[PDB]
Scaffold this active site. Structure first.
Site, mmCIF file in Angstrom:
data_model
loop_
_atom_site.group_PDB
_atom_site.id
_atom_site.type_symbol
_atom_site.label_atom_id
_atom_site.label_comp_id
_atom_site.label_asym_id
_atom_site.label_seq_id
_atom_site.Cartn_x
_atom_site.Cartn_y
_atom_site.Cartn_z
ATOM 1 N N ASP C 37 0.850 -1.182 0.000
ATOM 2 C CA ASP C 37 0.000 0.000 0.000
ATOM 3 C C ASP C 37 0.888 1.235 0.000
ATOM 4 O OD1 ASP C 37 -2.831 1.173 0.310
ATOM 5 O OD2 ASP C 37 -1.768 2.078 2.026
ATOM 6 N N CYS C 155 -19.477 -3.426 -7.471
ATOM 7 C CA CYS C 155 -20.493 -3.676 -6.450
ATOM 8 C C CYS C 155 -21.902 -3.619 -7.037
ATOM 9 C CB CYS C 155 -20.343 -2.673 -5.300
ATOM 10 S SG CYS C 155 -20.006 -0.957 -5.816
ATOM 11 N N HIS C 182 -26.365 5.643 -5.100
ATOM 12 C CA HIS C 182 -25.140 5.049 -4.589
ATOM 13 C C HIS C 182 -24.494 5.974 -3.573
ATOM 14 C CE1 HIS C 182 -21.362 2.792 -4.556
ATOM 15 N NE2 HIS C 182 -21.894 1.908 -5.385
ATOM 16 N N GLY C 214 -20.532 1.348 -16.356
ATOM 17 C CA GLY C 214 -20.680 0.135 -17.121
ATOM 18 C C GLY C 214 -21.331 -0.982 -16.346
HETATM 19 N N1 LIG Z 1 -15.752 1.390 -2.217
HETATM 20 C C1 LIG Z 1 -16.628 0.556 -2.794
HETATM 21 O O1 LIG Z 1 -17.828 0.577 -2.525
HETATM 22 C C2 LIG Z 1 -16.171 -0.420 -3.838
HETATM 23 C C3 LIG Z 1 -16.948 -1.550 -4.033
HETATM 24 C C4 LIG Z 1 -16.582 -2.467 -5.002
HETATM 25 C C5 LIG Z 1 -15.428 -2.221 -5.735
HETATM 26 N N2 LIG Z 1 -14.697 -1.117 -5.549
HETATM 27 C C6 LIG Z 1 -13.517 -0.975 -6.392
HETATM 28 O O2 LIG Z 1 -12.368 -1.402 -5.667
HETATM 29 C C7 LIG Z 1 -11.249 -0.562 -5.979
HETATM 30 C C8 LIG Z 1 -10.783 0.138 -4.708
HETATM 31 O O3 LIG Z 1 -11.737 1.105 -4.249
HETATM 32 P P1 LIG Z 1 -11.733 1.613 -2.728
HETATM 33 O O4 LIG Z 1 -13.085 2.213 -2.396
HETATM 34 O O5 LIG Z 1 -11.157 0.561 -1.810
HETATM 35 O O6 LIG Z 1 -10.690 2.835 -2.945
HETATM 36 P P2 LIG Z 1 -9.663 3.495 -1.890
HETATM 37 O O7 LIG Z 1 -9.175 4.744 -2.567
HETATM 38 O O8 LIG Z 1 -10.210 3.577 -0.489
HETATM 39 O O9 LIG Z 1 -8.454 2.411 -1.826
HETATM 40 C C9 LIG Z 1 -7.370 2.339 -2.767
HETATM 41 C C10 LIG Z 1 -6.109 1.992 -1.971
HETATM 42 O O10 LIG Z 1 -5.009 1.655 -2.824
HETATM 43 C C11 LIG Z 1 -3.885 2.479 -2.512
HETATM 44 N N3 LIG Z 1 -3.120 2.638 -3.761
HETATM 45 C C12 LIG Z 1 -3.385 3.470 -4.789
HETATM 46 N N4 LIG Z 1 -2.467 3.292 -5.774
HETATM 47 C C13 LIG Z 1 -1.600 2.338 -5.372
HETATM 48 C C14 LIG Z 1 -0.394 1.671 -5.928
HETATM 49 N N5 LIG Z 1 0.096 2.019 -7.142
HETATM 50 N N6 LIG Z 1 0.203 0.722 -5.177
HETATM 51 C C15 LIG Z 1 -0.253 0.384 -3.960
HETATM 52 N N7 LIG Z 1 -1.335 0.953 -3.391
HETATM 53 C C16 LIG Z 1 -2.031 1.917 -4.042
HETATM 54 C C17 LIG Z 1 -4.477 3.756 -1.950
HETATM 55 O O11 LIG Z 1 -3.529 4.404 -1.106
HETATM 56 C C18 LIG Z 1 -5.655 3.198 -1.165
HETATM 57 O O12 LIG Z 1 -5.197 2.727 0.110
HETATM 58 C C19 LIG Z 1 -11.743 0.454 -6.981
HETATM 59 O O13 LIG Z 1 -11.412 -0.030 -8.287
HETATM 60 C C20 LIG Z 1 -13.245 0.455 -6.808
HETATM 61 O O14 LIG Z 1 -13.896 0.765 -8.038
HETATM 62 C C21 LIG Z 1 -15.024 -0.206 -4.614
#
Ligand SMILES: NC(=O)c1ccc[n+]([C@@H]2O[C@H](COP(=O)([O-])OP(=O)(O)OC[C@H]3O[C@@H](n4cnc5c(N)ncnc54)[C@H](O)[C@@H]3O)[C@@H](O)[C@H]2O)c1
Ligand SMILES: NC(=O)c1ccc[n+]([C@@H]2O[C@H](COP(=O)([O-])OP(=O)(O)OC[C@H]3O[C@@H](n4cnc5c(N)ncnc54)[C@H](O)[C@@H]3O)[C@@H](O)[C@H]2O)c1
Ligand SMILES: NC(=O)c1ccc[n+]([C@@H]2O[C@H](COP(=O)([O-])OP(=O)(O)OC[C@H]3O[C@@H](n4cnc5c(N)ncnc54)[C@H](O)[C@@H]3O)[C@@H](O)[C@H]2O)c1
Ligand SMILES: NC(=O)c1ccc[n+]([C@@H]2O[C@H](COP(=O)([O-])OP(=O)(O)OC[C@H]3O[C@@H](n4cnc5c(N)ncnc54)[C@H](O)[C@@H]3O)[C@@H](O)[C@H]2O)c1
Lengths: 75, 338, 338, 338, 338, 68
Positions: C37, C155, C182, C214
Site C-alpha cells: 500500500d 459492487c 449510490h 458500465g
Molecule cells: N468502495 C466501494 O464501494 C467499492 C466496491 C466495489 C469495488 N470497488 C472498487 O475497488 C477498488 C478500490 O476502491 P476503494 O473504495 O477501496 O478505494 P480506496 O481509494 O479507499 O483504496 C485504494 C487503496 O489503494 C492504494 N493505492 C493506490 N495506488 C496504489 C499503488 N500504485 N500501489 C499500492 N497501493 C495503491 C491507496 O492508497 C488506497 O489505500 C476500486 O477499483 C473500486 O472501483 C469499490
C-alpha cells in the site's frame, strides 16, 4: 373512554351550573356547552376508531395531522 | 384590480412562494396581504429573511411587530389559528388562499377557508378526492374560473408531467416507471423517532429512505390518456433541496437517444419554454438551486434500448421551482378570475 | 496447503476484505500474509482497527511495527511500492493477489503482479479489455483454474446480476434499464476540486452526482444472453456506505408484482441462497450496513405495468457485501487452483 | 501601471480569490493574467463558473480552450506544471504570484517562483520559516516593499488576530486559549484513507475531527507582544464552509460581557471597519456565507467570569472572507510597489 | 428485590436506556415491565430493533403484538397516553418511572406519575425547580431514599462534572468556561421551520448552530463549591450522535499538561473507573459510538498556558453513555430503596 | 509552428468576442470564420499535461474513476 367519560361528567356538571347561573344564552354557557360537545364528539370519534381496530397512535395522528409524527408529504 | 392573497402555512413552500412573489411583484395581479401559521410575526419575519437554502433576502428590508410582517414597507398581517374556520378572511377580504400547511388537502378541509370567507383555495399538494389538479405548461389552460378549490399537484408531478407530455406526443408512451432521488423534506424525522410511516420515522440526513408516492400516477390526472399507465417510487437522500427524476418509458414509435434529446430540446425552446429546460452540461444538484424551470433534462443521461425503451433524467428544485409554478397558477386564476 | 494472499491497495475494499477474512478465518483456505500500500504499517493498522463505517475491530488485538501488521499474533508483512513489478511476491510465496488499488485493472496492469512472482490476480473492479469476469451466485462455477487474472466486477453488478438472472429465467428479459442511488466513494472530491471527470470534481457530501457506469452493461458479461440488452446510470448521494439499485425491465412472459416477488423469494431460499435476501420489511440504508447478501430485494417496492414492464429495487452494502463476495470468489479459486 | 498577477494553485482559495478580484476588478491595481494548476483550462473554467458553495458565477461568461480561460472576454493564460521553477513567469511578465497550492509554503519552495521570473510571492497560508506574516487590519502597514516572499497567515489567524488586538489594547491579554469549530477542508479525507495526520485520515463528513493548529501561536507573529501567550486546537465538523472561533483569555483589566461587546462594536465601526463586523443577530453558519469581514463577533455569546476570564465567539467564511484579505494584501503590496 | 420500572417516552434516550438494560439484564435489580409513548407497540418494537445509530439489536429477539413488546420473550406492556395522570402505574405495580419525554421535567409534571401510582420518578434531563440532581461518580452517594423525584442532569453536565471534580480536587478550580461541540438532537429542525429558539429553527444537518446552555452552570448543583464559577455555550454541528466538551479553567495550583493528564489518568484508573476514560489515541467522534463512560479525556489535546489556564477536551456519546448513567442511577436507587 | 501561433491567437479572439458579443452575433461569426480559414492550412501541413499526469498518477485524487 372511562377517563374521558369522567371528563364528560365533570364538563356536563359545570355546563349546567354555568348555564343555570350565567344564563341559558350567554358566552360562558355557549363555551361550556362547547367543551362538553367537543368531548362527546371525540368520545364518538375514539369509539368509532376502536371498532376499526385503530391504535391510539392512529387516533392521535387523525387529531394532529400537522404533528411531526404524522406528516406525509407526497414528494 | 388585484387579488388579495393569504398564505396558510408559512413553511418551506409558503416562504418560498412569498419570496417568489416579492421578486416578481412588479408584474403581478396578486397582492399578498395576510399570513396564517403556527408561529408569531417576528419568528415568521426572521425565517423569511434568513433562509439556509435561499440565503439572506436582500431586495427589501423585512421587519415585524406584534401583528404584521413588513417587506419593504408593504405590510402583511399575521394570525395563528390551526382551525381555518376562525381565520379572518372576511375582515381581511381574502380572495385566494394559498393552502400550504400540508393538512387541508381534502375538499372538506380546504373548504373551511371558504367558510371563513375566501373565494378560492389553491392547494400546494395533491388533492385528496376529486379536486381539479393542474400542472402549469401541461393542462393549466383547462382551468375553469368556476372552480373554488384547486391543486397544483406535487413537485415530482410538476417535474415529470411536462416531460411525459413531450415524449407521449412525440413517441407515444405505452407504460412508464419513475424513481425520484429526492432531497429530504419536513415530513421525515431528524433522528429515529415515532412516525406513522416506518420509513419516514428514520434519521433523514443519515439514510436513503424509500417512500411510496402517487406523483407518477397523478401524471394521469393532467394527461388523461395515460391514466393507469404510470407508476413509481421516491428515494429521499441526505440533501436539503433539489431532486432528480429518473423516467423509463416503453414507447410505440422506435427512436434513439439523440432523437429523444432533440425532441425535448425543441419543445423547451417552443411549447415548453420556461417549463422544461434542456441541459447538455455535466452539472450536479447544487447547480440547480433557484432554477425556475419545472424540469431540467440532463441530456447526457438519456439512453434508449431496442428502439422502444427510453430513459430520461431531469432535475428540479423541489422548493423553488415548484413555488414559481404555484405563483404561475395563482396568476392564471387571477387573470381568469370569475 | 493454504493459498497465500497479498492485498495490493489497503483502502476501503482492501481493509473490508481483510476484516471479512479475519471473521471467517477459522474455515478458510486463504492465508493473508502480505500487504502492499502507499502507506506505512502503523497507519494502516490504525485504519484497520478504527473504521468510521465498521466500528472498532473487536475480535483480535491489532498491532504494528515498521515491517508488519499483527492481527491476533497473525503477522502480515508490509511493503510500500507503487510499482507492482517491484513487489516481493516470489520471495513471500504469494499465490493470489487481491488487486484493490483501483489502478491495475487491465491485463497489462494486473500482469505486473505476475511478473513479480504471484500466480493469480483477483481484481476488485471491472476489468479493462478481455478479462474474465465473475459474479458469485451467477457464473462463478464457470471459473477455469487456468485463468490467472480475473475480475469480481463492481459492487453494482454484483447486486444487479443475481436478480437479473432470476427474472430472466422466470420471465425472459428483453431489455432492462438501471439506476443505482449510490453512496459516495473515494473517487469523488470532498470539496469542488480538480478531476478529469467534471462530476466527480464536485463536493461529494453536498451533492447528488450523476456518473456514467458500465455496471449494467457488465451484467451481459456474466449473463451472456443479455449482452447489449442492459444499460444504466449512477447517482452518488451524500451517504458514506450502502447503495440501492432500481431496475426496470421489459419481460416476455406477462406477470404481476406478486409473481415477481414470489420468484425472487423462492430463489433466495434455493438457487440464490446467501446471494439474494428477500425482505418485506420497511427498512432504510443504515439497516443494511454489514449485510452479507449481494442483493436485498425490497419487496414492498416491486411494481409491474401492463404485465410486461417490471420494476424491482434492491439494497447492497457496496463495501462489506462486495468484499464478502471477493472473499467468496478467492475461496472458490483456492478450491479450484489447478 | 498595474501589477500583473499569476495564481499558482486554482483550488478553493485560488478560485475564491479570482472571483473576489472579478467583483472588485473596476477598482483594482492588479490584473490577473495567468494561472498554473494540475488541471487543464477547460476543467478550471468549469469549476470557476460552477461552485457548490458560491453558486454559478453570474457577472460574465466563462469559457476556455486548450490554452486560456476567458472571463468576460478577458483572457487568462494557463499552464500545468507542478514544478514552479519551470513556469513561464518571465515570459508572461508576472509581477506577483499568489501561492495557493498548499505545498510551497517554505521560503525555498516559494522562491522557485522568483527564479522562474516572478518578482514577489504571496503565500495564502502560514509560512514555514523566516517569512514575514501579515494580517490585514492587524499589522499590514508594517509591510516592507523590499520583501519578496510574504505570508497572509491562515483563515483562523485572520479571524482571531483582529479580535485579540482589540481585546489586548482594551483589557491586556495575559493568556488565551482557542478552539475553532471549523468546516472541513480539502486536506481531509472523504472516506477513511491514509493521511499523515491520523485524525484528518477519517471520513470528514461523518466525524468531528480534532486537529492541531498553529493559528493561535501565529497570532503571536502579527501581535509580537503576545508571542508565546496563545494556543489552541481545531475541531473539524461536517459543514463544507464557514467556521467559528471560540477564544477564552485571562485579561488584566476586569470587565463584564457588556463592556467587552461595546469595545469590539466601537472598533468595528472605526479602527477595524471592514475587518471586524459586530453582530447582535441570532444566526447560524449558513447566514455568514460570502461575508466580507475577517471576524463576525456573535455578541449574544460573549461571557465573562470573575472580571478577568473572557470568552468571545466569532464567525468567519474561511474561503471567501480569507480570499478577500488575500486580495486586500495584494492591493496593498501593489500600492507600495517598489 | 426487583424494582418494577416503566419508561415514559420511548425516544432516543428511552430506547437507548432499554437497550442498555437488556444487555445488563443478568446483573440488574430492575425489571422493565411497561412503556408509555406516542406510538403503538408494533412501531416501537420496530424502532427499538432498527436503530440508525446503534444498528440492529443483536442480543435478543424483538417482537410485538397490539399490546406488548417482547424482548427475549420478556413481555413489556405498552400504552399510549399523553397525560401521565391517566397511566396504569398502580395496576401495573410500577415502582420507578424513567421520565424521558422531555415534557415532564418539573415537579408539577413529574408528580403526575406519582398520583397515577408510581412510587419514584427519575427525570432523564435537568429537573426544573428544587428537584435533587445527581451525576453518577460525582454526587450520587448523596441520594436520599426518601426523595420521590430525582434528576440525572444533562448529557453535557455528565461529561463535564466528573472532569471538573478531578481537576478541582487536584489544582483548585477558580473559574471555568466550556464550549460543547455537540451532535444535533430531536429539538432541532431538519429544515428551517418554526421554533421558539430562532437558532434551533435552522436546518440542523446544514449548519453550525450556537445555543445557550445550562450545562456548565449545572455543575454547581452537583459540586456546590463551584456554584457560580462555571459558564459556557453549545455549538450544534451536523453529526447525529457523539459530542465533545472543551473546558478552559483558571486553577489555583500552577501545573503543566503532563501533570493534568496524569491526574485524570490516575482518577480514571481508581475512583472514576467507568466514569472517566483516559485516551491517548488519535480518535474521532465515530470511534466513541457506544462508549460506556461519561467522559473520555482526549489527552493529546491537553494544554496549559502560564501555569494557571488549563484546557482539557473530553468526548461523550450523548445518547448511550448518558443512558448508561440513567441505568446506573436507577440501579443505585434500587439498591437503596425506601 | 508559426501558423499555429496564428491559430492560437485567432482562437483567443473568437472566445473573447463570442463571450462579450454573443454566440449569435455577426462579430462572433467573423471571429470563428477567421479561425476556420487558418485551420484549413493545418490540413495542408495531443495529450494535455493533466492527461499525462493522470497516466502517471492514476491513484491521485484528480484521476480516480471508480465504477460504482
Ligand atoms: N468502495 C466501494 O464501494 C467499492 C466496491 C466495489 C469495488 N470497488 C472498487 O475497488 C477498488 C478500490 O476502491 P476503494 O473504495 O477501496 O478505494 P480506496 O481509494 O479507499 O483504496 C485504494 C487503496 O489503494 C492504494 N493505492 C493506490 N495506488 C496504489 C499503488 N500504485 N500501489 C499500492 N497501493 C495503491 C491507496 O492508497 C488506497 O489505500 C476500486 O477499483 C473500486 O472501483 C469499490
Ligand atoms: N418542500 C417541498 O419540496 C414541497 C414541494 C411541493 C409541495 N410540497 C407540499 O407543500 C406542503 C407544505 O410543505 P412544506 O415543505 O412547506 O412543509 P413545512 O412543514 O415546512 O411547512 C408547513 C407549515 O405549515 C404550518 N402548519 C401546520 N399545520 C398548520 C395549521 N393547522 N394551520 C396553520 N399552519 C400550519 C407549519 O407550522 C409549517 O410552518 C406539503 O403538502 C408538501 O407536500 C412541498
Ligand atoms: N480552504 C480554506 O479554508 C483555506 C483558508 C485559508 C488558507 N488556505 C490555504 O490555501 C492553500 C490552498 O488550500 P485550498 O483549500 O485552496 O486547497 P485545494 O486543494 O482546494 O487547492 C489547491 C490547488 O493547488 C493544486 N496543486 C497542488 N499541487 C500543485 C503543484 N505542485 N503545482 C500546481 N498546482 C498544484 C491542486 O490541484 C488544487 O487545485 C493551502 O495552503 C491552505 O492551507 C485554505
Ligand atoms: N438525545 C440526547 O442526547 C439526550 C441526552 C441526555 C438527555 N436528553 C433528554 O432526554 C429527554 C428525551 O430526549 P430524546 O432525545 O429521547 O427526545 P425524543 O424526541 O427522541 O424522545 C421523546 C419521546 O417521548 C415521546 N413523547 C412525547 N410527548 C409525550 C407524552 N406526553 N407522553 C408520552 N410520550 C411522549 C415522543 O413521541 C418520543 O418518542 C429530553 O428531556 C432530553 O432533554 C437527551
Amino acid at each position: 373512554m372511562s377517563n374521558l367519560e369522567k371528563q364528560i361528567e365533570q364538563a356536563r356538571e359545570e355546563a349546567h351550573k354555568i348555564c343555570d347561573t350565567e344564563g341559558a344564552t350567554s358566552g360562558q354557557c355557549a363555551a361550556a356547552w362547547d367543551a362538553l360537545e367537543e368531548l362527546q364528539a371525540e368520545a364518538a370519534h375514539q369509539r368509532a376508531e376502536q371498532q376499526d381496530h385503530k391504535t391510539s397512535f392512529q387516533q392521535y395522528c387523525d387529531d394532529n395531522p400537522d404533528a411531526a409524527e404524522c406528516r406525509i408529504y407526497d414528494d | 384590480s388585484m387579488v388579495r392573497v393569504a398564505i396558510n402555512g408559512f413553511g418551506r413552500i409558503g416562504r418560498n412562494f412569498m419570496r417568489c412573489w416579492l421578486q416578481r411583484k412588479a408584474n403581478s395581479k396578486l397582492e399578498i396581504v395576510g399570513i396564517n401559521d403556527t408561529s408569531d410575526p417576528r419568528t415568521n419575519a426572521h425565517l423569511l429573511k434568513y433562509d439556509s437554502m435561499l440565503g439572506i433576502f436582500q431586495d427589501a428590508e423585512i421587519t415585524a411587530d406584534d401583528d404584521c410582517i413588513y417587506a419593504g414597507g408593504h405590510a402583511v398581517k399575521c394570525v395563528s389559528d390551526r382551525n381555518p374556520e376562525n381565520l379572518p378572511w372576511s375582515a381581511w377580504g381574502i380572495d385566494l388562499v394559498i393552502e400550504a400547511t400540508g393538512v387541508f388537502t381534502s375538499r372538506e378541509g380546504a373548504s373551511k377557508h371558504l367558510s371563513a370567507g375566501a373565494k378560492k383555495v389553491l392547494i400546494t399538494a395533491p388533492g385528496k378526492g376529486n379536486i381539479p389538479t393542474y400542472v402549469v405548461g401541461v393542462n393549466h389552460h383547462t382551468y375553469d374560473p368556476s372552480e373554488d378549490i384547486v391543486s397544483n399537484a406535487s413537485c415530482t408531478t410538476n417535474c415529470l408531467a411536462p416531460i411525459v407530455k413531450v415524449l407521449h406526443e412525440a413517441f407515444g408512451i405505452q407504460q412508464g416507471m419513475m424513481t425520484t432521488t429526492h432531497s429530504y423534506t419536513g415530513d421525515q424525522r431528524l433522528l429515529d423517532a415515532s412516525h406513522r410511516d416506518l420509513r419516514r420515522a428514520r434519521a433523514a440526513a443519515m439514510n436513503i429512505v424509500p417512500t411510496s408516492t402517487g406523483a407518477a400516477k397523478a401524471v394521469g390526472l393532467v394527461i388523461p390518456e395515460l391514466q393507469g399507465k404510470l407508476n413509481g417510487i421516491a428515494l429521499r437522500v441526505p440533501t436539503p433541496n433539489v431532486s432528480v427524476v429518473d423516467f423509463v418509458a416503453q414507447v410505440e414509435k422506435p427512436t434513439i437517444a439523440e432523437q429523444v434529446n432533440q425532441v425535448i430540446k425543441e419543445a423547451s425552446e417552443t411549447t415548453m419554454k420556461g417549463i422544461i429546460h434542456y441541459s447538455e452540461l455535466e452539472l450536479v444538484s447544487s447547480d440547480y438551486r433557484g432554477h425556475n424551470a419545472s424540469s431540467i433534462l440532463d441530456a447526457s443521461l438519456t439512453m434508449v434500448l431496442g428502439g422502444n425503451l427510453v430513459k430520461v433524467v431531469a432535475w428540479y428544485d423541489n422548493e423553488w421551482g415548484y413555488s414559481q409554478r404555484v405563483l404561475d397558477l395563482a396568476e392564471h386564476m387571477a387573470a381568469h378570475w370569475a
